[PDB]
Design a protein around this motif. Structure first.
Motif, PDB file in Angstrom:
ATOM      1  N   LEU A 259       0.811  -1.210   0.000  1.00 29.48           N
ATOM      2  CA  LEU A 259       0.000   0.000   0.000  1.00 29.48           C
ATOM      3  C   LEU A 259       0.847   1.263   0.000  1.00 29.48           C
ATOM      4  CD1 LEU A 259      -2.623   1.393   0.141  1.00 29.48           C
ATOM      5  CD2 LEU A 259      -3.041   0.375   2.344  1.00 29.48           C
ATOM      6  N   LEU A 260       1.881   1.229   0.825  1.00 34.14           N
ATOM      7  CA  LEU A 260       2.777   2.347   1.069  1.00 34.14           C
ATOM      8  C   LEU A 260       3.592   2.701  -0.179  1.00 34.14           C
ATOM      9  CD1 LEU A 260       4.438   3.936   3.624  1.00 34.14           C
ATOM     10  CD2 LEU A 260       5.134   1.688   4.158  1.00 34.14           C
ATOM     11  N   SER A 261       4.027   1.679  -0.909  1.00 30.58           N
ATOM     12  CA  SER A 261       5.108   1.829  -1.885  1.00 30.58           C
ATOM     13  C   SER A 261       4.783   1.688  -3.372  1.00 30.58           C
ATOM     14  CB  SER A 261       6.216   0.828  -1.577  1.00 30.58           C
ATOM     15  OG  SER A 261       6.817   1.112  -0.340  1.00 30.58           O
ATOM     16  N   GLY A 262       5.466   2.509  -4.162  1.00 29.74           N
ATOM     17  CA  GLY A 262       5.593   2.273  -5.586  1.00 29.74           C
ATOM     18  C   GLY A 262       7.090   2.107  -5.786  1.00 29.74           C
ATOM     19  N   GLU A 263       7.502   1.016  -6.426  1.00 35.42           N
ATOM     20  CA  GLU A 263       8.904   0.843  -6.801  1.00 35.42           C
ATOM     21  C   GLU A 263       9.089   0.249  -8.187  1.00 35.42           C
ATOM     22  OE1 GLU A 263       9.506  -1.564  -3.549  1.00 35.42           O
ATOM     23  OE2 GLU A 263       9.741   0.096  -2.130  1.00 35.42           O
ATOM     24  N   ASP A 264       8.093   0.411  -9.048  1.00 38.64           N
ATOM     25  CA  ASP A 264       8.155  -0.196 -10.369  1.00 38.64           C
ATOM     26  C   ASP A 264       9.296   0.377 -11.208  1.00 38.64           C
ATOM     27  OD1 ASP A 264       6.026  -1.787  -9.731  1.00 38.64           O
ATOM     28  OD2 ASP A 264       4.533  -0.589 -10.811  1.00 38.64           O
ATOM     29  N   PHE A 265       9.465   1.699 -11.164  1.00 35.06           N
ATOM     30  CA  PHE A 265      10.496   2.398 -11.938  1.00 35.06           C
ATOM     31  C   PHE A 265      10.380   2.038 -13.409  1.00 35.06           C
ATOM     32  CE2 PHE A 265      12.394   2.291  -7.664  1.00 35.06           C
ATOM     33  CZ  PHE A 265      12.753   3.618  -7.499  1.00 35.06           C
TER      34      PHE A 265
ATOM     35  N   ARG B 141      -0.624   8.553 -10.030  1.00 28.40           N
ATOM     36  CA  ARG B 141       0.430   8.435  -9.029  1.00 28.40           C
ATOM     37  C   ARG B 141       0.670   9.724  -8.250  1.00 28.40           C
ATOM     38  NH1 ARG B 141       5.881   8.200 -12.844  1.00 28.40           N
ATOM     39  NH2 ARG B 141       5.571  10.245 -13.838  1.00 28.40           N
TER      40      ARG B 141
END
Ligand SMILES: *[C@@H]1O[C@H](CO)[C@@H](O[C@@H]2O[C@H](CO)[C@@H](O[C@@H]3O[C@H](CO[C@H]4O[C@H](CO[C@H]5O[C@H](CO)[C@@H](O)[C@H](O)[C@@H]5O)[C@@H](O)[C@H](O[C@H]5O[C@H](CO)[C@@H](O)[C@H](O)[C@@H]5O)[C@@H]4O)[C@@H](O)[C@H](O[C@H]4O[C@H](CO)[C@@H](O)[C@H](O)[C@@H]4O[C@H]4O[C@H](CO)[C@@H](O)[C@H](O)[C@@H]4O)[C@@H]3O)[C@H](O)[C@H]2NC(C)=O)[C@H](O)[C@H]1NC(C)=O
Ligand SMILES: *[C@@H]1O[C@H](CO)[C@@H](O[C@@H]2O[C@H](CO)[C@@H](O[C@@H]3O[C@H](CO[C@H]4O[C@H](CO[C@H]5O[C@H](CO)[C@@H](O)[C@H](O)[C@@H]5O)[C@@H](O)[C@H](O[C@H]5O[C@H](CO)[C@@H](O)[C@H](O)[C@@H]5O)[C@@H]4O)[C@@H](O)[C@H](O[C@H]4O[C@H](CO)[C@@H](O)[C@H](O)[C@@H]4O[C@H]4O[C@H](CO)[C@@H](O)[C@H](O)[C@@H]4O)[C@@H]3O)[C@H](O)[C@H]2NC(C)=O)[C@H](O)[C@H]1NC(C)=O
Ligand SMILES: *[C@@H]1O[C@H](CO)[C@@H](O[C@@H]2O[C@H](CO)[C@@H](O[C@@H]3O[C@H](CO[C@H]4O[C@H](CO)[C@@H](O)[C@H](O)[C@@H]4O)[C@@H](O)[C@H](O[C@H]4O[C@H](CO)[C@@H](O)[C@H](O)[C@@H]4O[C@H]4O[C@H](CO)[C@@H](O)[C@H](O)[C@@H]4O[C@H]4O[C@H](CO)[C@@H](O)[C@H](O)[C@@H]4O)[C@@H]3O)[C@H](O)[C@H]2NC(C)=O)[C@H](O)[C@H]1NC(C)=O
Ligand SMILES: *[C@@H]1O[C@H](CO)[C@@H](O[C@@H]2O[C@H](CO)[C@@H](O[C@@H]3O[C@H](CO[C@H]4O[C@H](CO)[C@@H](O)[C@H](O)[C@@H]4O)[C@@H](O)[C@H](O[C@H]4O[C@H](CO)[C@@H](O)[C@H](O)[C@@H]4O[C@H]4O[C@H](CO)[C@@H](O)[C@H](O)[C@@H]4O[C@H]4O[C@H](CO)[C@@H](O)[C@H](O)[C@@H]4O)[C@@H]3O)[C@H](O)[C@H]2NC(C)=O)[C@H](O)[C@H]1NC(C)=O
Ligand SMILES: *[C@@H]1O[C@H](CO)[C@@H](O[C@@H]2O[C@H](CO)[C@@H](O[C@@H]3O[C@H](CO)[C@@H](O)[C@H](O[C@H]4O[C@H](CO)[C@@H](O)[C@H](O)[C@@H]4O[C@H]4O[C@H](CO)[C@@H](O)[C@H](O)[C@@H]4O)[C@@H]3O)[C@H](O)[C@H]2NC(C)=O)[C@H](O)[C@H]1NC(C)=O
Ligand SMILES: *[C@@H]1O[C@H](CO)[C@@H](O[C@@H]2O[C@H](CO)[C@@H](O[C@@H]3O[C@H](CO)[C@@H](O)[C@H](O[C@H]4O[C@H](CO)[C@@H](O)[C@H](O)[C@@H]4O[C@H]4O[C@H](CO)[C@@H](O)[C@H](O)[C@@H]4O)[C@@H]3O)[C@H](O)[C@H]2NC(C)=O)[C@H](O)[C@H]1NC(C)=O
Ligand SMILES: *[C@@H]1O[C@H](CO)[C@@H](O[C@@H]2O[C@H](CO)[C@@H](O[C@@H]3O[C@H](CO)[C@@H](O)[C@H](O)[C@@H]3O)[C@H](O)[C@H]2NC(C)=O)[C@H](O)[C@H]1NC(C)=O
Ligand SMILES: *[C@@H]1O[C@H](CO)[C@@H](O[C@@H]2O[C@H](CO)[C@@H](O)[C@H](O)[C@H]2NC(C)=O)[C@H](O)[C@H]1NC(C)=O
Ligand SMILES: *[C@@H]1O[C@H](CO)[C@@H](O[C@@H]2O[C@H](CO)[C@@H](O)[C@H](O)[C@H]2NC(C)=O)[C@H](O)[C@H]1NC(C)=O
Ligand SMILES: *[C@@H]1O[C@H](CO)[C@@H](O[C@@H]2O[C@H](CO)[C@@H](O)[C@H](O)[C@H]2NC(C)=O)[C@H](O)[C@H]1NC(C)=O
Ligand SMILES: *[C@@H]1O[C@H](CO)[C@@H](O[C@@H]2O[C@H](CO)[C@@H](O)[C@H](O)[C@H]2NC(C)=O)[C@H](O)[C@H]1NC(C)=O
Lengths: 132, 447, 447, 132, 132
Positions: free
Chosen positions: A23-29, A47
């Motif tokens: 929930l906290l994170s986006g790290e797809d890059f 985003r």
């Protein structure tokens, strides 16, 4: 990931960290390397409101007696008028979805006790106790 | 005794709407061909998508109220214009067309001579082209004009890009989630016993078609019947097949590209002479496979319309060409097929009273889909014969209003709205936002 | 005994690629003249740039693998189109041109009469202009046409903006860093003994030129020789000078602007009659200064090709005009100079067997650089005589493939790729991302 | 600024704050006053992924036993199998670049001990110890 | 909301939380549904620099001896050379606007004592006191 949503509140406390992570994170890059005027705003609008919705939650966590993630406690006494219940009737016999349903009326009231009655009055209290 | 405590990350979500992005599987990018369909910068799909089964959970789904459809519908539309923006505009093609009958099948093709502007602005250019009858309209030898000139403007699609559908996974940004219905039999409405969550939806090919769902997802066990309002004859009936139906659509005209020069810098691709079979476009459907499917489908309709009743099929009633025919894209060209031959039948309670079948197809280069005015797209000619093989995964059907409700019912192929096409793949998905913040009473208090 | 502990901000970085922005020094903005080159909103440079010398550090650099070059190359290209987008398009200039020989030097200039559209769409306009021979091509009195009309489209550059190069500092966003090699002698490959870090790169003037690096950075002590693969004759050889070479390029034609009205609202600037010296554009190089440099450079090549050998120079082999000549911009006009006079020499081991030299230059207003098709830019005429003085800071050289490797070697001026021009300034820089998070064992534990 | 990267880990702890500052922050407040469709996205794409990369680091700092920046400690015991070494052989005789090189295999393992073994099991442990 | 700006510093400590709330947060969730190339950047440029200005303040709060919002204390001794005054002359007789006016010269000096003299030297001190 949400696996305990159907399970009881008592069992739902074990997987609590997993929900916090994703929930906290986006790290797809992934993406945003080559520009587009059209679609790109659309992958932006999602985003950008996401991090705005994110900091919104973090503020409550900070201004309250938490100052940290996951679980944190407070000096606010539980009112009898707020879901008068049995302790085993809450965690063991009841579920979170079923729980938030009833507190819906007192939710805005409880929020006030955290920011006003505590961190406004607690930190000032702390300042008076740290002087001596 | 107890005290309030903040829990972060509690399993609580609410139904909501957000902006979803795409995923290209990071292979479509290696497919290249200068930005095929959507994928240009499109997001590489996670090699290992995650599906989490939620035990002891029951969620009610509605596919007709699904918001993921409306976004996808507007996506394809917005995607379409952006492909046509950098390309070459055909604006000065509205010149008078002197046409004549081609050397059989009542002269479907017109050989047209016309005046054209060269690179220089001084002298014109006398050149001829080949247009289908659907692309031109006479105005009062035989003189014709572009069919779209009185209605709207026109632009040519770039030969570099292709309309070839590639798998697209819809995913949700941080703070949201997508629910997946894992049941074998689901009509799109009601509670779902087994629900799983995914970051990205499955592979969905944005294939735009009418009267036939092409290259879609197969159903499980029994074939599925889906409709927004069933007893209402004003609402279309979406069907999902079990076994895929082999379909062949070809362009039995071996063509050449003129590539005339209308500079400076711009070059239009005209349709040259046809070298090969003299034929009209045709669509093949195997008589055995369609029938077998029909027999299984016609039994499913009787789970509603009653065990015993007469169900008759017939071709399209009438309307726009997009509604009355099967419209799609194969090899860059746009085929319009006559489905009247397949829908000619009459069924008994369990039964109906050769090795192949064929369907006459018409070709139209200049098209306005989605009822668009102001922009018309010209499909560029393709070198050689185009052949394609696709799966028929479902239909769009409508019921007649004439009743006589207790006697018999007749069903006809639908059309129009393309959202139904996307509802076919999106019926098992819906968007919800997660609420991490929660409060619970406990003894811990604080010092 | 110990326990793990999180350290934040540890000195750890990894080689990576990111998106770098510009810096204009906040003075270029006061230079105004309606958005000169890049600087419009361009970032004001920090008045006090920071350079931190890292002691006890050795880092290996590769200038040919540097990603900062590829971004800068695409930047200038993207910068170029955006300057041409709001400007006036010259599309209806493809009208037939009736030309005649100007009143010496084999009629380099053509006086051309043609028909033109006025503000009104009714009556045309009979007017004459003056174009260079390189800008026109005859088609079969003498009739000509624009040279770019058959190849591509064309648009005129706005007279408001200028092509004048201004210092541009490339900087990195938060989370990244740029390394600087402080050694006096560096060929762009291998380990660097003294490495310093900076937020912004030094002042870099994006001067686009061929066969001559103009307005660049001088080397330290000995002159530098740089090549991707040296023994390979297919790879160009980049040279960096010690002392700057004075070069003069002028337009010995004192001109006037017609400013004809091709409305509504648009006005084209035609080239009027030439009042002054009847001459061809020329480039001056001082015989003493070029020779002195040559003697020092020719000794550096013998640190590779051997102490004793014959090194002969010759002009360009052949190819496009951009490759065979020295191409640049001075005062808004684009000069193409004949360097054949400078490269005519033969050297002995330490030596080679007047007060000035000159180089014939050609002018071309319509240009396609970077092999661009679909867009051609027209350089607007400039009032009066243009004079400019620049530094020659380096060359682009190629070696012949004919060998006879153990006998002698011949070098000729290169061209083509403009990335080499940027590699000249970027050889000492590379981009890395910083990793702050770290773990180390310590006794502290926790209560 | 990175000056101790070549120096030993023991000396690298003194300048630790400097790296924390510059890395953490953008305060230029330069540009973005007058709009451009083209270049502007480019100066956006860099700083947007920057703050995304930023919050990514901050999450690990929060979900672990830190809840604060710079240095913080934990209850995770150092395994012998993880870089068996001498204490003076690490800080005094070895450098960070040289250090992260070896731990590369156990890095993902150690991360698990911080979020799972601690703040999941520690905070729950704290809740049980704060009740009495 | 700023109501005590005219009032004394002593009275201004009561409404402190209100300023913290509104300043900290955007929760309008209004607009950005349908795209525009032109105006949209303008409604972007404002809120993007807003969150950049936001994290700028949060950094000082973290790198200093606070690690939490509202009020927090420190080990930095108050210098006599910095606004030599009476205690009742500050909170009771003086206002914040009037207060920040004089400290303007020593503001940059005090900032150094928080990040350098404390959290650089305090956390290292803590590490040495937590070992035993
Ligand atoms: C999805 O699609 C489906 C179908 O595809 C849609 O279903 C349709 O839903 C609508 C509702 O909006 C239905 O119309 C409504 O029908 C009811 C019932 O009518 C039937 O029964 C009546 C009584 O039957 C009993 O009594 C007799 C006598 O003893 C017995 O013999 C019977 O066996 C029963 O026991 C009967 O009177 C009706 O006949 C009349 O109507 C039909 C239909 O028009 C005619 O053919 C007949 O000749 C005859 O005239 C019928 O058999 C009605 O009660 C509803 O009327 C209300 O609404 C009217 C507006 O349409 C309004 O003018 C009326 O005044 C009435 O409103 C009254 O009631 C309200 C509620 O209490 C009050 O608030 C109001 O103030 C007022 O008092 C209505 O006509 C459709 O029939 C149904 N379709 C089909 C095919 O049946 C569905 O809507 C769709 N939904 C969605 C979301 O898409
Ligand atoms: C940057 O630029 C530089 C130059 O500008 C580039 O350098 C070039 O690099 C390539 C490598 O890709 C070289 O080609 C390779 O050369 C080697 C060596 O060949 C020389 O020596 C051989 C043996 O010499 C000894 O033995 C004799 C006999 O006793 C003694 O007298 C000698 O003194 C030595 O002791 C000799 O046989 C060679 O002569 C033959 O080849 C030359 C060149 O073509 C001819 O002129 C001759 O007439 C004669 O035919 C030569 O003198 C070769 O061994 C390489 O062959 C491999 O690759 C071939 C493909 O090119 C392949 O077909 C072969 O089968 C062979 O592959 C074998 O070896 C592999 C490795 O073990 C195995 O995996 C494989 O399965 C197979 O077994 C190759 O030809 C270039 O010579 C060199 N350029 C110059 C000018 O020398 C550099 O590549 C560039 N790099 C970058 C990054 O840009
Ligand atoms: C529903 O799903 C189905 C299945 O997924 C869809 O069917 C797909 O249809 C695609 C076409 O729209 C088709 O794409 C084709 O792939 C073929 C195979 O490619 C692979 O093999 C080649 C080697 O042959 C590899 O190099 C390559 O990397 C792949 O691994 C290609 O052969 C196809 O190219 C030919 O067809 C298209 C039109 O279909 C032409 O535009 C194209 O130019 C090619 O046509 C030339 O070549 C053939 C011989 O190969 C000649 O007979 C023909 O006359 C053409 O020759 C002239 O023209 C070319 C230039 O065009 C010129 O150079 C030459 O000299 C001649 O002048 C095409 O790339 C998918 O493969 C196919 N799916 C499957 C699984 O096969 C269906 O479309 C979907 N439904 C909808 C509505 O989308
Ligand atoms: C490599 O680096 C070198 C060095 O850095 C580069 O050389 C640079 O070249 C620039 C031109 O491209 C040049 O810019 C010039 O600056 C001159 C000096 O400006 C300063 O002095 C004036 C007072 O004279 C101050 O007001 C001003 O604020 C500055 O402090 C200007 O004088 C130049 O303007 C003239 O030249 C350009 C073309 O070079 C014309 O476009 C411009 O219009 C001016 O020309 C008119 O004026 C001269 C007399 O000044 C007349 O002789 C001429 O015929 C023109 O007169 C007619 O036209 C004007 C309108 O154009 C009209 O009003 C008039 O009535 C007539 O009809 C120009 O601004 C840099 O200074 C120079 N660098 C240095 C250090 O000097 C080199 O380009 C680089 N290489 C590359 C490839 O970029
Ligand atoms: C749409 O188009 C598709 C593609 O064309 C159609 O699907 C194809 O349908 C055909 C026929 O229905 C089918 O062809 C057969 O495939 C078999 C393998 O699956 C082959 O073995 C077989 O070849 C034999 O027959 C040919 C014709 O008689 C001979 O020319 C060939 O040499 C073969 O004969 C050999 O084998 C015998 C023993 O069996 C031996 O004695 C001989 O010596 C010799 O060795 C057919 O070609 C395709 O396989 C189908 N393709 C696919 C992908 O399924 C579809 O039917 C079309 N739909 C419509 C509605 O028209
Ligand atoms: C490219 O162009 C540039 C710019 O034009 C060239 O660089 C210039 O080169 C010239 C000559 O090489 C040089 O001019 C001299 O500069 C001296 C100062 O550095 C001046 O003192 C000198 O003036 C005297 O000579 C002139 C001509 O003879 C007289 O007209 C003038 O009045 C001077 O005479 C006086 O001084 C003597 C004593 O010495 C005294 O007895 C007299 O009474 C009187 O007082 C020259 O003008 C420029 O300085 C150079 N400019 C720069 C910026 O360096 C370059 O050479 C060109 N390159 C090519 C390849 O052509
Ligand atoms: C329409 O569907 C029906 C089935 O409902 C198809 O009937 C099928 O007819 C074929 C013959 O053409 C049957 O094959 C036969 O198989 C038997 C047993 O192996 C064999 O003895 C015969 O010689 C012949 O090969 C097939 O079994 C039968 N279907 C069923 C389910 O029994 C019909 O073929 C379809 N329409 C068309 C186009 O034929
Ligand atoms: C379509 O009509 C054009 C004429 O408008 C045909 O082109 C002519 O073909 C004949 C061959 O019988 C030539 O002799 C002429 O020189 C052609 N004229 C031009 C202007 O091209 C064309 O052949 C017809 N369609 C085709 C190609 O069958
Ligand atoms: C689509 O198929 C139907 C069925 O074959 C065609 O209907 C024919 O229409 C013509 C008149 O155009 C009649 O002369 C035939 O008798 C009809 N056939 C039958 C079997 O009744 C129809 O023409 C086809 N195409 C279109 C565009 O309508
Ligand atoms: C280029 O040619 C044009 C004519 O096309 C010249 O313009 C003429 O100049 C003479 C002077 O000898 C005048 O008498 C005419 O009236 C001019 N005609 C027009 C249409 O302008 C022009 O002079 C030539 N180039 C120059 C200016 O030398
Ligand atoms: C560039 O300079 C060279 C060297 O002067 C020129 O070469 C001359 O070419 C002409 C033919 O065009 C010959 O008649 C001369 O004899 C050549 N000169 C010498 C010294 O050999 C060349 O023409 C110049 N320009 C171009 C565009 O080639």
């Amino acid at each position: 990931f949400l696996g305990a949503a159907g399970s009881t509140m008592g069992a739902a406390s074990m997987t609590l960290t997993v929900q916090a992570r994703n929930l906290l994170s986006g790290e797809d890059f992934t993406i945003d390397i080559p520009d587009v005027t059209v679609w790109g705003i659309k992958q932006l609008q999602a985003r950008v409101l996401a991090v705005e919705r994110y900091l919104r939650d973090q503020q409550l966590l900070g201004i309250w007696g938490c100052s940290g993630k996951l679980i944190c406690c407070t000096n606010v006494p539980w009112n009898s008028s707020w879901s008068n219940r049995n302790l085993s009737e809450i965690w063991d016999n009841m579920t979170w979805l079923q729980w938030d349903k009833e507190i819906s009326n007192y939710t805005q009231i409880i929020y006030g006790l955290l920011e006003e009655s505590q961190n406004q009055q607690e930190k000032n209290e702390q300042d008076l106790l740290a002087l001596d | 005794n107890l005290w309030v405590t903040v829990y972060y990350g509690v399993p609580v979500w609410k139904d909501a709407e957000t902006t979803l992005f795409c995923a290209s599987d990071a292979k479509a990018y290696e497919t290249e061909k200068h930005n095929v369909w959507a994928t240009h910068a499109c997001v590489p799909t996670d090699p290992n998508p995650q599906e989490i089964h939620l035990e002891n959970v029951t969620e009610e789904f509605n596919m007709w109220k699904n918001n993921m459809v409306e976004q996808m519908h507007t996506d394809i539309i917005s995607l379409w214009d952006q492909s046509l923006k950098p390309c070459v505009k055909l604006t000065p093609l509205c010149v008078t067309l002197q046409c004549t009958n081609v050397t059989d099948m009542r002269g479907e093709l017109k050989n047209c001579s016309f005046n054209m502007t060269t690179e220089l602005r001084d002298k014109k250019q006398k050149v001829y082209s080949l247009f289908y009858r659907l692309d031109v309209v006479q105005i009062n030898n035989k003189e014709y004009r572009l069919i779209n000139c009185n209605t709207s403007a026109i632009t040519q699609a770039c030969p570099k890009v292709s309309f070839e559908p590639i798998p697209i996974h819809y995913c949700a940004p941080a703070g949201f989630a997508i629910l997946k219905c894992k049941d074998k039999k689901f009509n799109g409405t009601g509670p779902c016993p087994s629900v799983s969550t995914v970051q990205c939806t499955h592979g969905i090919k944005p294939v735009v078609s009418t009267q036939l769902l092409l290259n879609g997802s197969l159903a499980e066990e029994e074939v599925m019947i889906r409709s927004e309002n069933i007893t209402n004859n004003a609402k279309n009936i979406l069907v999902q097949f079990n076994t895929p139906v082999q379909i062949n659509c070809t362009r039995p005209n071996n063509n050449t590209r003129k590539s005339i020069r209308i500079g400076p810098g711009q070059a239009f691709y005209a349709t040259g002479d046809i070298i090969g079979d003299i034929r009209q476009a045709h669509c093949n459907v195997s008589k055995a496979t369609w029938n077998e499917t029909l027999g299984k489908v016609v039994k499913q309709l009787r789970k509603h319309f009653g065990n015993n009743t007469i169900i008759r099929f017939a071709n399209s009633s009438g309307g726009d060409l997009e509604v009355t025919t099967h419209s799609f894209n194969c090899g860059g060209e746009f085929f319009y097929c006559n489905t009247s031959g397949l829908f000619n039948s009459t069924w008994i309670s369990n039964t109906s009273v050769n090795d192949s079948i064929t369907l006459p197809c018409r070709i139209k280069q200049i098209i306005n889909m989605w009822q668009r005015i102001g922009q018309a797209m010209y499909a560029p000619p393709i070198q050689g014969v185009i052949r394609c093989v696709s799966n028929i995964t479902g239909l769009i059907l409508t019921r007649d209003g004439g009743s006589t409700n207790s006697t018999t019912e007749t069903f006809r192929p639908g059309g129009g709205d393309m959202r139904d096409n996307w509802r076919s793949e999106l019926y098992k998905y819906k968007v919800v936002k997660i609420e991490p913040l929660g409060v619970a009473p406990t003894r811990c208090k604080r010092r």
